[PDB]
From Swiss-Prot, chain B:
It is found in: Cytoplasm. It catalyses: L-asparagine + H2O = L-aspartate + NH4(+); Cleavage of a beta-linked Asp residue from the N-terminus of a polypeptide. Belongs to the Ntn-hydrolase family. One of its GO terms (molecular function) is asparaginase activity. The lineage of its organism: Eukaryota, Metazoa, Chordata, Craniata, Vertebrata. This is Isoaspartyl peptidase/L-asparaginase. The keyword Protease applies. The modification N-acetylmethionine is found at residue 2.
Length: 296, 296
């Protein structure tokens, strides 16, 4: 049976301040750690990635759940999806409000409906039906996000895993881009763009410019090259380069093959990432500055 | 410069009655003659796919715009998308209510906003700001879909085109599936699933069970096979073959390649379709049951 793996990412975007980096490092650590714990206790790939993403949702340092960037009217509107590599079963929500964990709502879409994707009003009704708390909107909104919205007027997080039965899955969640139009949905809830997971290939979650990732189908394009026998680093580079060269888009991705190989590559300035395997934890943000600590 | 071609499809769905076949043929042949007439003026592939789909939206026999199926709460919520293969520009909307023409609003999303995807209340706001008129739900609901729902308590339409300057496009529009949960979203506004266009390969629109179509990312998949060297037909066979085996889902698709080669194919029992090229209309509903006619 397979040695499990989890890989996590935050936003594939521009440079990050030094104080942030420390808060960021700990966040990538907490979610990688949380996800791997699940796998080391016999849990599924879906459990793991759901677990890591929740961690980043609950962490105000990340553009997902509490800490989501603001729309053009200063409200949080969140998108997410999750996908089971075994039968390709999937769950998604877009433009959901007043909840803590869009990724869990996403998981409920998959497991407790015959659908794959709900939006806005219906998503909110379904939440209520599932006994998902409704939190005051102001709780998701941070003071620092306000300064982004007030200023801008005048990145997506996620996870992939390979589990101890050799199954794969991705989860992704975002608040989107600062000053987005109300009801702007990006790449996250859109299968093949914000992520893709198939047991016959591997799994991918993307991040960066939502519209660009959508236009080129970045997650599934990444896996196609793996289908043709490109290596994981070979495929991520080709796929990302094509978003750059065709639609002028930048961003990042992480991947795990069904054989255990993994990578994190980004054409954006930075992308916080972490990978746990063989009892060790890998972490970074900027190119060629990784650390590798022991995960007891 | 290339010979222009438009292909249109109705819903990839169940047996059609002998009685009802003629009237679907009527609306389909109309849809195609609109698209083709736009192309003959040297209109763009994007113009041609939009007008073709506006005709099916307005026609109450087809499940998009007027004639949309009803959700669990008795109402019409609509999805649509359009894509320009020249630069991968796209627009899409989901869960929109009380407007005649979803496909027209997805194009406005492509052209007028920095985004490709608006949903529900955000889409209402944008449609208002652009002067789209509020249409009552009662003028979108057919007696058939008032009744059909009760049976529970048809399908997605599209077009692809290649214009007189080598540009390919797709457009697609739907009411979804009868008694769907409020705010359910199918493949139709998810780029790569409901359709995909790329001047460097071709354009596809899909129909059928939208959850399956999302899972397999059916439209991008067909283009993967084309790129790999397969004919439009083989590619259709392989992607629909895969969807059937892997997720036990049925549907169909139209595809036109960069070289002006085209096909309509389905694994459902029925898929109304019509194509116009070289002054000829080809149309059918059942397999190997095609007729050709001259066009004015
Ligand atoms: Cl292994
Ligand atoms: Cl030609
Ligand atoms: Na981040
Ligand atoms: Na967060
Ligand atoms: Na209609
Ligand atoms: Na665009
Ligand atoms: Na746009």
């Amino acid at each position: 049976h397979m040695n499990p793996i989890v890989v996590v990412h935050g936003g594939g975007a521009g440079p990050i301040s030094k104080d942030r980096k420390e808060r960021v490092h700990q966040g990538m650590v907490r979610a990688a750690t949380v996800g791997y714990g699940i796998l080391r206790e016999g849990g599924s790939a879906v459990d793991a990635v759901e677990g890591a993403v929740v961690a980043l949702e609950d962490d105000p340092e990340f553009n997902a759940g509490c800490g989501s960037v603001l729309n053009t009217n200063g409200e949080v509107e969140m998108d997410a999806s999750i996908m089971d590599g075994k039968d390709l079963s999937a769950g998604a929500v877009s433009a959901v409000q007043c909840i803590a964990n869009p990724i869990k709502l996403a998981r409920l879409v998959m497991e407790k409906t015959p659908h794959c994707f709900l939006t806005d009003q219906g998503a909110a009704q379904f939440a209520a039906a599932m006994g998902v708390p409704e939190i005051p909107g102001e709780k998701l909104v941070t003071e620092r996000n306000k300064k982004r919205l007030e200023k801008e007027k005048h990145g997506t997080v996620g996870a992939v895993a390979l589990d101890c039965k050799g199954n794969v899955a991705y989860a992704t969640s975002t608040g989107g881009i600062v000053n987005k139009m109300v009801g702007r949905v990006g790449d996250s809830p859109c299968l093949g763009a914000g992520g893709y997971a198939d047991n016959d290939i591997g799994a991918v979650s993307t991040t960066g410019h939502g519209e660009s990732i959508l236009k080129v189908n970045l997650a599934r394009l990444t896996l196609f090259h793996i289908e043709q026998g490109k290596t994981v680093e070979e495929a991520a580079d080709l796929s990302l380069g094509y978003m750059k060269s065709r639609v002028k888009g930048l961003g990042g991705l992480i991947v795990v093959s069904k054989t255990g190989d993994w990578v994190a590559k980004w054409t954006s300035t930075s992308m916080p990432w972490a990978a746990a395997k063989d009892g060790k934890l890998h972490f970074g943000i900027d190119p060629d500055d990784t650390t590798i600590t022991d995960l007891p």
